[PDB]
Design a binder for this molecule. Sequence first.
Ligand SMILES: [Ca+2]
Ligand SMILES: [Mg+2]
Length: 629
Amino acid sequence: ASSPANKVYQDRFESMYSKIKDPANGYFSEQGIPYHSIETLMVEAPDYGHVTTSEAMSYYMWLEAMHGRFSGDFTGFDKSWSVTEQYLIPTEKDQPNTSMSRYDANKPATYAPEFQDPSKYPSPLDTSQPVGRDPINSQLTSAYGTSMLYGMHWILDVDNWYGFGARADGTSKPSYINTFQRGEQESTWETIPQPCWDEHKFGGQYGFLDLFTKDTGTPAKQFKYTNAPDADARAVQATYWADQWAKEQGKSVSTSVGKATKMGDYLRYSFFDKYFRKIGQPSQAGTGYDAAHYLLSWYYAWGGGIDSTWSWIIGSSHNHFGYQNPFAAWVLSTDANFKPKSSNGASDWAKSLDRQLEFYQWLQSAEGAIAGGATNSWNGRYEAVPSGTSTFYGMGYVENPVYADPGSNTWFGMQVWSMQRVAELYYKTGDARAKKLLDKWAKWINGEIKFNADGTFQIPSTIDWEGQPDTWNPTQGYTGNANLHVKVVNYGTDLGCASSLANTLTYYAAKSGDETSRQNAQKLLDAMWNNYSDSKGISTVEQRGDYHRFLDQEVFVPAGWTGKMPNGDVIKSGVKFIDIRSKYKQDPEWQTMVAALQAGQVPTQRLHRFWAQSEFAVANGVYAILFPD
Ligand SMILES: [Ca+2]
Ligand SMILES: [Mg+2]
């Protein structure tokens, strides 16, 4: 039998759950897939509101798990996994085993440099540059009997708004697409949306392939998918809780546990350097596990031929603290119900758990906030790490890993999303490393929360950094990083971040007994419920400072390259963001947004992001369970 939960906050979860699942609110497509946001005029990570991400799917799982805890019904949770497997994990038709089975573990892929400006692409493939060996592929094929990978592709065109369709048919939905391809300076506004399955039917002469990679001969028809490790790790985290809550009620989600465990087994590909180069000695090809940094890197990707048999797989050299998940690592390495079928699955995750906690501590600033991360590929070309640059196991410190437009660690959100997982670990195991991290971080954040007399509040929004951490010495440990400082540039009322913060403070308070954290967590939840509730969940008016880029952001296209988007939009040098997305002009909010820009004003919006609504719902549920009285 489940333990008693705080009635007030449980009702708040149930109310939010009803608003999110309400057919009249439009959070989901006809196929049952959650959108990034209800509103369509939306540009953040995705460049259209009805395009979805693996992040959203993992939040959908978390939401349904919590619903199972209070209702006793877990069919909704099992359904979230069914939708995930059907639409976000490439099927046998999307990643033909005929090509995947030709994968060569001794030559995983062909090296191509990364550049600091989109105008430097396409990047030339170089078969003469070293590439290490993949030590886990044999483990996976042996355990699962297939060469296909079981992981979520990160972004999906849910209602086929771009027109690529499924496997080049241009009419089916949902449609697998990808955007980011050209380095740290390619913002969401500077991409050229492309299909994952490229048969050269759309775009240019050879599809969109020669916009990104330059090969010796003619570009072959091929497919390619890209994973978002933090999303897959959250799916494991959510499934663990679903399993625990189901068992407390004599229920079972066995089938879903198996899927999560398999996903976690494949997620290990994010532990490796992009081209399997040795960690700390980037110029040398790895011989196996010496190319594993054991952290959840920015991605792992794979692809292969469509009309010819061949395939490749790559990990990632760039690591961001915001993507780590010590809780998922603990689950996969210690819980017997979640033990990966592969020979080294559980043991690799054990090593990752320890490495991840070292990573967090190394990045903890003098104040308490966690800094960016590190990379094993300086400038994305394995260049020499400048002297004086601090390192972590040979990897150079990087203030804003992977992206600089805007800086990947200038958003407060990464702080709460990641520390929330550390709080769950600390609550479950009382781990000393986790406690030390949280004690300092919590003291920092509790001093940055501002409550107004009218019931509204503010928390850090944009942050900046100065200095770097001291080089990591595993035997020395935390030095305090007196020369690493965080600075809060401005405050805001981001309801998604506030909910994640409340969640984090609740788990921490529950275990540590810190009253300051508990009352702040409750005050945030109450303030949002009482002052920001609407018929669709919660929301507030926010300024969209980058929306001017809709009209004035030029998109780079190589000289002489021309093509067309499915709707006829011409792609050629000189086009702006809007020129290759002309359907945006038919959006109900278009005229309003354009009017604002024409008057020299910053557009404003009231947005209902799926992850934010779910985050708030879950935070209420977590408080109800940990503080029943
Ligand atoms: Ca840029
Ligand atoms: Mg990613």
